[PDB]
């Protein structure tokens, strides 16, 4: 059965990105909305809209492509996993492709990017690398 809805969300983006689909839909969750918002404001996706339904809601993601339909997202990697949770301390916060990518980190201050986490000088659970 599905054991990692976050990894499912990242893979749905990766697979849709591979074939350059305009949009993508996923079952909603708070963490998935948090990740979608970070992709939105970091310039990796074009937009995100939310659909209220009867089960758990749906989040619609609008993928982003540049001139010549160059992919803005190269790939996404799940770091922390149900089988092996990954935690970093404030000084262990990773830099992804020397800052050209981002790491999404869950902290007691919320779900934030690697830039924000080391500004606040806090660590947490590393959710995903995005570049």
């Amino acid at each position: 059965v599905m054991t990692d809805p976050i990894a499912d969300f990242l893979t749905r983006i990766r697979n849709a990105n591979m074939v350059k689909h305009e949009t993508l839909e996923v079952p909603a969750s708070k963490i998935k909305r948090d990740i979608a918002e970070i992709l939105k404001r970091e310039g990796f996706i074009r937009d995100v809209e939310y659909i209220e339904d009867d089960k758990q809601g749906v989040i619609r993601v609008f993928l982003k492509y540049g001139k010549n339909e160059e992919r803005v997202i190269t790939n996404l990697k799940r770091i922390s996993k149900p089988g092996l949770r990954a935690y970093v301390k404030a000084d262990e916060v990773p830099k992804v492709l020397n800052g050209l990518g981002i790491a999404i980190i869950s902290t007691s201050e919320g779900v934030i990017t690697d830039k924000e986490a080391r500004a606040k000088n806090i660590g947490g659970e590393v959710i995903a690398y995005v570049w």
Partner: peptide
Amino acid sequence: KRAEEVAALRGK
């Protein structure tokens, strides 16, 4: 990847 090209693609 070049930082300028990455920044342009991300609108940053």
